Amino acid sequence: YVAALFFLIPLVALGFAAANFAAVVRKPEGTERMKEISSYIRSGADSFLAHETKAIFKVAIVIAILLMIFTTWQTGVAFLLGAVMSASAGIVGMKMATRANVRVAEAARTTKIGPALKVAYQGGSVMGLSVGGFALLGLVLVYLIFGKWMGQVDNLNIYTNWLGINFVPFAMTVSGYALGCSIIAMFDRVGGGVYTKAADMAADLVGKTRNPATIADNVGDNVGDVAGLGADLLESFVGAIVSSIILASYMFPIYVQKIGENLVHQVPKETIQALISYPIFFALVGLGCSMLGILYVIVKKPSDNPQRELNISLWTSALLTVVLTAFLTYFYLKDLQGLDVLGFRFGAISPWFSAIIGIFSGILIGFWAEYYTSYRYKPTQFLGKSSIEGTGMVISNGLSLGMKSVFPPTLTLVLGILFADYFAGLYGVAIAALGMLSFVATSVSVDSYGPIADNAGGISEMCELDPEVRKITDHLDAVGNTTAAIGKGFAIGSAIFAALSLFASYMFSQISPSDIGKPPSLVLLLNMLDARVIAGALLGAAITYYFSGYLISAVTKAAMKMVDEIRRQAREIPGLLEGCIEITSDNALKQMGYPAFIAILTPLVTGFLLGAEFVGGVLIGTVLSGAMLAILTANSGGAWDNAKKYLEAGNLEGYGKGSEPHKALVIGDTVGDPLKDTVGPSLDILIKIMSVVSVIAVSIFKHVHLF
Amino acid sequence: YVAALFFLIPLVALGFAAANFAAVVRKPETERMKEISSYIRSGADSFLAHETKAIFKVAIVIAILLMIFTTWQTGVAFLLGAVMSASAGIVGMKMATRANVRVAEAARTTKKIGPALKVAYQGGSVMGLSVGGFALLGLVLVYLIFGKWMGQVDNLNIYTNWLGINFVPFAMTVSGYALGCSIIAMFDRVGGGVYTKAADMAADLVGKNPATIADNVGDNVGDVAGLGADLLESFVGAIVSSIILASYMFPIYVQKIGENLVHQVPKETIQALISYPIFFALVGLGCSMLGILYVIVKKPSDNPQRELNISLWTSALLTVVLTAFLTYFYLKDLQGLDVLGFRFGAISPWFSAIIGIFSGILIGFWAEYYTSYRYKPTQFLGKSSIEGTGMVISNGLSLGMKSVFPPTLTLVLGILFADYFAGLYGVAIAALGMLSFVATSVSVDSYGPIADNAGGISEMCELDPEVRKITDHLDAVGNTTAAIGKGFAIGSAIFAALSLFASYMFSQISPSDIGKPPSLVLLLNMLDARVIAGALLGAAITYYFSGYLISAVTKAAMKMVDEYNRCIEITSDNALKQMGYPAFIAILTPLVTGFLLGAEFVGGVLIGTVLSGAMLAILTANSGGAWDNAKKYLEAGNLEGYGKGSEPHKALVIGDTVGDPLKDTVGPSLDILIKIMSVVSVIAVSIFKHVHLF
Ligand SMILES: [Ca+2]
Ligand SMILES: [Ca+2]
Ligand SMILES: [Mg+2]
Ligand SMILES: [Mg+2]
């Protein structure tokens, strides 16, 4: 076996990707104009992937060596597995996305809206199924090879390496895996995010110096919401599972009591081992459920409403997972012992209640993102309508909106944390994070749908293929845009929940051989009353604000550098001949190290200067600040965009376009775009990677710091 | 001898106010010059009247509540503080709205710019000297009456009141005093701040004598009374926190030695440590008086920035020196200072005060750095105007988000070093040193509006260009020193709030902890899910609060746009109406969450609030000042070919209108939120440590 059965799920997911690829690839594209536009963007995507991958390779090697020297070789391998695993997923989804777009638009005419959705969604699913299969294939490998074969799940005492750096082997191994996933996420957001909006600015910046720099912007849409959103969600997914494993693993040395000079493990090996393996199996059942959710919607009789379709896959994947999960939990944790001490209030079933809380939190966090972002509800409506009072008002109201929009989703996270932890303690928080993300394949599938449609729509526009064809196309895109704001919203929620599990992980990972005496409560402690901790927290909040400010300026730097590649193309051409991607792609990368140094090196520097408490502080400031700003920037940016739309759909009598309010709404959307698509999504990654790195380096700086 | 000597300093400060008032009042004002002044002076009174009455109604309710749930002394202390800060604002405003006319006339009658500075600064000083004298007069009273006479500084143990609510009496008493100062600051910012920007918007939303006068009174409401009440609350907050930590150090450092309780830090030590910060602040006020008087009496200058600055530097150098003697001699043979956290014995906390002083100055520099055309960030913003309004907004948001790091790094280093010298007590003394010399800090603040009105009053009257030159210059300097001022007041609010957080945790010690190790009782564990949730809740409340205030400003402005004391009263009334809500958030959040979920969660909430509020306060101050000064930059003539009209200028105008509510309403309100939420929590944790629901 029953267990191998589970362990081969990721393989079917991967083959399933391979099949959806096939079945889409065998779909056709129409006109030479339809093919030509696709290749523009498809080649455009490859160029960017090429340059980015090479940069990723260079950093991954250096990190791998470093891990191998300072921790253990297993950890460095695990790191590479994760880097290869997430890398692979992005590379596959993008290849799909940039080929499915043409075949959506042709679906919209050759077929005649439902069978165009059936195409788009099959495409979207290649990114989602690859995200699940790869991420879980990797963890299965690490569990099987380093955990079982090499016995890291059999020993799991506190190991001390050739430099006297001490850690629990498996905990450390999977921490490396997580770092691998993080680094490709970081590159995809802080690098690809700059590119994407650098393109959008540049395109949206014409004084007459179609088809000028549109293709860069069109690739951006895939870079951002296929690859970027996918890497983001992947990291949070692995982060949640890895954290469950790290807390479980360390529970072994924590729950020992000396009795007559024996060390008695109050939570025993069987329990720890099950608790380590459980989240993997939990996530596997999820993938199986998500495959059923995805396949169902593809094979299903078609609809006229693609939102309901996309949603049927989501709801289906989640109902399914809740049900099977409760059996998995009862049967898998039926007789373990020490679950009381472990934090399980209702014995065995406890963490399932936690997973469920996370699931519902995720969905609610989705609803809130829609609520604050969709004309259709009040906040955006109001924003939209205030346009008649001017650009200042539009800006001030949008800032006001997003600042307020932070409360409902956060209350939802607060209640989720409280309840998660009521059922199953800190382990329960991480399992809730995992439940929140348990149907990640389907979540990611609906995300990737957005750009496929967006390109499909634009391709219709560039080609000017009919109006009747264009109607289905605009609708598909319209739905992309809603599901995309829900998507960003859900991915910020999951980033916060994952980061908070990784913070629990950071503290658990500090247990030393010399603590095995002490009470759990003296070892599982970060005291906020400590000045180092207060300082840490302040430093981390400010670093997060800096990071965000820097990324805005980065986007505007790169855009402008492109305009000039345009300007030198248009100064070159019109004089003689009437009237890229790599350039801005290269500058996006160049202007990335700096953010990446902040993300990766901040724990290291502050850790080696001031130690584990201060870094504990830093991680807390970072998550608190980052959680809030991520939400503010998503919502403000979304609201501003959908407000512009609102008037464009003619919901303000007598204004509908190039009018003074429309202009004011355009200016808000231009301020908003870098916030929603670059700042917020980068912060998701910052609040995670900074934690993973810390989890690993606290091996060294608990003991070896300067002051 | 030195006892009463020190305790009468606040009285001299107050007489000194009364003298600067007199010597200004005797200064003269044209009919146009008088008429405009009265418009704005009457305008100010109208607003003060409506606000005070509102304050009164809330302060009575809070006082009876304090008397029922804690002790009557606490309620009295609360009222003393409310009366004390209230009084200061009323005095500084009366002065401001009369000094303005006599600056402008100075600029012509007296015929030059240095003796107009001498007027303006004398005016400014009434607000500053009143702030110090009142705040300290109060604390002296509480120390003398409740501490000494009624023996609260003699008795010192853990008292349990008629409802079984337990607390250390003096700690609790001064916590009330702090709440009083907080309430009037809250009203002055979250109420007066909405008025001031409601007025600015409305005026800037009607391009053609509008009841702009409202906007001119706003300038006083905001930077005389509001900045003043803000700084006052941080000042008292820092002193009170020093006292709270000291007081609780008594039950904290007890060893259970074979069924006796042995106080490892003894009454003499505690009592000095309670009294020390008061005396420290008193020496400061004395020094600030010398700083203020020196600059007034001084031979005049051509440069009023140097003047204002001479008073600051003079007040601070002076304080550093005398303070060292005060510290050595007052704590020299004290005992148990080791256990208290004093790394270098007696002198230790002086090193802490010094760190705070320098932090304050640096935090000032940063504010200027991110806000003044003259330096790179604002220059760049200004020159990006040629690329559009979007760019101006994005670059300004980008500027302020970045501008947070240097001043925060300054706080981080300050906290680390404060605590290295003298522990958590040292952090609070750092906050106090930062804010020692507060009279002179507040004097330079109040100078700004006095000049601003002074300038405007020249512009409305049309009195010469040569006269107008001195005027514009005076105002020009006001605007720089105001940005430094905001910047310093945010720094002090954070340092205060962090002390009050320390105070919040100290205040939870129970009779049943008097055995336990300090380290098991002075603990808020971040690994606890309640604490994590708390922090997230508090950070979200803070963002909400800020959002709500933006919207409040635009609501009231618009209310004005639809149509001079009535017009001031209408929007003044709505400003108050639209205040309860923020005030509920500030005051009631600890109570609701405390009674639901307890002390740890609220500990969380407070941490989120401070961290989030500190960052947003800085962002908004700097981005707002940047935008303003970038508009100015082009207005002085700096891109070339563009000026006071033109598409970039328009774009800079739009950024300044987005900025104005952020720098003058959101940020300064956040200073208060991060403080009052703590003071309230310090007090109500008496009850909800024990009595909460889940
Ligand atoms: Ca947009
Ligand atoms: Ca302004
Ligand atoms: Mg597009
Ligand atoms: Mg004015």
Tab-separated table of C-alpha atoms in Angstrom, chain A residues 201 372 389 391-393 395-397 399-408 410-411 413-415 417-418 421 426 429 496 500 503-504 507-508 521 523-539 541-543 545-553 556-557 560 610 614 620-621 623-625 627-629 632-633 640 667 670-672 674-675 679, chain B residues 201 370 387 389-391 393-395 397-406 408-409 411-413 415-416 419 424 427 494 498 501-502 505-506 519 521-537 539-541 543-551 554-555 558 597 601 604 607-608 610-612 614-616 619-620 627 654 657-658 661-662 666:
chain	number	residue	atom	x	y	z
A	201	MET	CA	6.119	49.881	-17.586
A	372	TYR	CA	-10.987	43.708	-1.814
A	389	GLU	CA	-12.590	63.622	-7.773
A	391	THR	CA	-5.681	61.331	-9.348
A	392	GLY	CA	-4.770	62.271	-5.733
A	393	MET	CA	-7.979	60.839	-4.469
A	395	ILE	CA	-4.104	57.178	-5.075
A	396	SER	CA	-5.021	58.079	-1.494
A	397	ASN	CA	-8.192	55.915	-1.653
A	399	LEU	CA	-3.607	53.145	-0.400
A	400	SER	CA	-6.425	53.534	2.188
A	401	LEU	CA	-8.226	50.449	0.725
A	402	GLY	CA	-5.242	48.139	0.843
A	403	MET	CA	-4.142	49.271	4.275
A	404	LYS	CA	-7.651	48.349	5.545
A	405	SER	CA	-7.839	45.142	3.460
A	406	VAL	CA	-5.169	43.597	5.561
A	407	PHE	CA	-7.463	42.984	8.574
A	408	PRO	CA	-9.937	40.349	7.411
A	410	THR	CA	-5.097	38.446	8.863
A	411	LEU	CA	-7.927	37.812	11.363
A	413	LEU	CA	-4.764	33.653	9.817
A	414	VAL	CA	-4.932	34.525	13.540
A	415	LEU	CA	-8.002	32.308	14.080
A	417	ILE	CA	-3.209	29.619	13.949
A	418	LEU	CA	-5.070	29.608	17.326
A	421	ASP	CA	-2.522	24.877	17.636
A	426	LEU	CA	3.008	23.719	16.836
A	429	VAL	CA	0.323	24.802	12.759
A	496	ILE	CA	2.647	33.352	5.853
A	500	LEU	CA	5.426	30.698	10.605
A	503	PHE	CA	9.947	29.916	12.268
A	504	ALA	CA	8.779	27.128	14.625
A	507	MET	CA	13.552	27.454	17.095
A	508	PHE	CA	13.264	23.635	17.256
A	521	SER	CA	9.728	24.945	27.963
A	523	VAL	CA	14.505	25.161	25.194
A	524	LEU	CA	11.501	26.059	23.040
A	525	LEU	CA	11.755	29.772	23.900
A	526	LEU	CA	12.359	33.105	22.130
A	527	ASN	CA	11.900	35.798	24.651
A	528	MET	CA	10.597	38.990	23.295
A	529	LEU	CA	11.596	40.767	26.468
A	530	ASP	CA	15.228	40.334	25.465
A	531	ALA	CA	16.670	43.515	23.931
A	532	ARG	CA	18.511	41.492	21.265
A	533	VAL	CA	15.211	40.074	20.204
A	534	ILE	CA	13.495	43.439	20.134
A	535	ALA	CA	16.355	44.833	18.092
A	536	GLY	CA	16.328	41.858	15.802
A	537	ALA	CA	12.657	42.333	15.129
A	538	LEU	CA	13.081	45.988	14.406
A	539	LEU	CA	15.968	45.276	12.033
A	541	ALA	CA	10.901	44.831	9.672
A	542	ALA	CA	13.044	47.640	8.271
A	543	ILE	CA	14.939	45.225	5.988
A	545	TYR	CA	10.560	47.685	3.910
A	546	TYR	CA	13.910	48.397	2.295
A	547	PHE	CA	13.661	45.310	0.144
A	548	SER	CA	10.299	46.440	-1.132
A	549	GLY	CA	11.422	49.964	-1.844
A	550	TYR	CA	14.424	48.649	-3.664
A	551	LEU	CA	12.271	46.423	-5.921
A	552	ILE	CA	10.070	49.300	-6.962
A	553	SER	CA	13.095	51.291	-7.975
A	556	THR	CA	11.530	51.493	-12.883
A	557	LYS	CA	15.331	51.360	-13.574
A	560	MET	CA	13.504	52.820	-18.515
A	610	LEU	CA	24.778	38.689	17.394
A	614	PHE	CA	18.691	38.275	17.441
A	620	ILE	CA	9.713	37.779	13.385
A	621	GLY	CA	10.024	41.368	12.132
A	623	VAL	CA	7.215	37.894	8.736
A	624	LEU	CA	5.067	40.408	10.494
A	625	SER	CA	6.182	43.187	8.117
A	627	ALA	CA	2.865	39.531	5.729
A	628	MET	CA	1.218	42.921	6.011
A	629	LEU	CA	2.918	44.560	3.023
A	632	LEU	CA	-1.463	45.693	1.153
A	633	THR	CA	0.367	45.649	-2.202
A	640	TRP	CA	-6.557	49.911	-8.798
A	667	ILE	CA	-2.129	56.427	-13.173
A	670	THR	CA	0.604	52.112	-13.149
A	671	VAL	CA	1.551	52.740	-9.499
A	672	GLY	CA	-0.203	49.488	-8.613
A	674	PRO	CA	4.857	46.957	-9.595
A	675	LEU	CA	3.256	46.651	-6.160
A	679	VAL	CA	6.720	43.770	-4.405
B	201	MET	CA	-7.461	69.120	1.271
B	370	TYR	CA	15.235	61.606	3.252
B	387	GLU	CA	8.556	61.214	-16.408
B	389	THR	CA	2.622	61.434	-11.879
B	390	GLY	CA	2.812	57.571	-11.663
B	391	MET	CA	6.592	57.783	-11.443
B	393	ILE	CA	4.049	58.364	-6.737
B	394	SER	CA	5.988	55.115	-7.231
B	395	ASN	CA	9.344	56.817	-6.574
B	397	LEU	CA	6.593	55.254	-2.065
B	398	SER	CA	9.936	53.669	-3.012
B	399	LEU	CA	11.861	56.500	-1.241
B	400	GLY	CA	9.929	56.179	2.019
B	401	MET	CA	9.998	52.389	2.095
B	402	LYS	CA	13.793	52.620	1.819
B	403	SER	CA	14.060	55.554	4.203
B	404	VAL	CA	13.042	53.327	7.044
B	405	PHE	CA	16.398	51.468	7.268
B	406	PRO	CA	18.828	54.075	8.496
B	408	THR	CA	15.684	51.903	12.315
B	409	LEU	CA	19.328	50.711	12.317
B	411	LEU	CA	17.216	52.473	16.982
B	412	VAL	CA	18.550	48.870	16.798
B	413	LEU	CA	22.067	49.927	17.770
B	415	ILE	CA	18.547	49.524	22.037
B	416	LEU	CA	21.541	47.070	21.993
B	419	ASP	CA	20.754	47.524	27.304
B	424	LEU	CA	15.937	47.051	30.271
B	427	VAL	CA	16.430	51.216	27.502
B	494	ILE	CA	9.256	54.070	19.334
B	498	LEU	CA	9.417	49.787	23.673
B	501	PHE	CA	6.267	47.156	26.403
B	502	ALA	CA	9.018	46.350	28.942
B	505	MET	CA	5.788	42.613	31.037
B	506	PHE	CA	7.176	43.771	34.353
B	519	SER	CA	13.953	34.518	33.871
B	521	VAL	CA	8.599	35.545	34.906
B	522	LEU	CA	10.142	38.205	32.644
B	523	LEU	CA	9.175	36.175	29.572
B	524	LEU	CA	7.036	36.515	26.424
B	525	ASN	CA	7.662	33.450	24.330
B	526	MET	CA	7.306	34.035	20.610
B	527	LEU	CA	7.108	30.323	19.945
B	528	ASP	CA	3.678	30.369	21.632
B	529	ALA	CA	0.882	30.361	19.013
B	530	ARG	CA	-1.130	32.921	21.023
B	531	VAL	CA	1.816	35.269	20.889
B	532	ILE	CA	2.291	34.776	17.111
B	533	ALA	CA	-1.411	35.321	16.506
B	534	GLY	CA	-1.384	38.350	18.794
B	535	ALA	CA	1.455	39.923	16.818
B	536	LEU	CA	-0.242	39.310	13.523
B	537	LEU	CA	-3.480	40.772	14.871
B	539	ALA	CA	0.151	44.482	12.879
B	540	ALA	CA	-3.165	44.233	10.907
B	541	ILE	CA	-4.959	46.598	13.365
B	543	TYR	CA	-2.564	48.970	9.074
B	544	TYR	CA	-6.344	49.237	9.432
B	545	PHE	CA	-6.062	52.209	11.707
B	546	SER	CA	-3.892	53.986	9.152
B	547	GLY	CA	-6.161	53.180	6.287
B	548	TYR	CA	-9.164	54.345	8.223
B	549	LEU	CA	-7.445	57.721	8.926
B	550	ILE	CA	-6.744	58.403	5.294
B	551	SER	CA	-10.332	57.818	4.480
B	554	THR	CA	-11.014	62.698	2.734
B	555	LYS	CA	-14.503	62.235	4.298
B	558	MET	CA	-15.300	66.800	1.357
B	597	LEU	CA	-7.319	35.552	25.181
B	601	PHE	CA	-1.792	37.352	23.258
B	604	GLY	CA	1.843	39.658	20.893
B	607	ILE	CA	4.729	43.782	19.507
B	608	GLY	CA	2.969	43.702	16.147
B	610	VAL	CA	5.024	48.676	17.614
B	611	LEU	CA	6.901	46.975	14.824
B	612	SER	CA	4.191	47.834	12.268
B	614	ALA	CA	7.205	52.168	13.749
B	615	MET	CA	7.753	51.235	10.116
B	616	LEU	CA	4.618	52.913	8.743
B	619	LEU	CA	7.431	55.611	5.708
B	620	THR	CA	4.601	58.081	5.768
B	627	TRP	CA	6.861	64.849	-1.945
B	654	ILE	CA	-0.556	65.457	-6.893
B	657	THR	CA	-1.719	65.981	-1.881
B	658	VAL	CA	-1.306	62.181	-1.475
B	661	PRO	CA	-2.522	63.135	5.014
B	662	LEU	CA	0.318	60.595	5.321
B	666	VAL	CA	-1.261	58.877	9.531
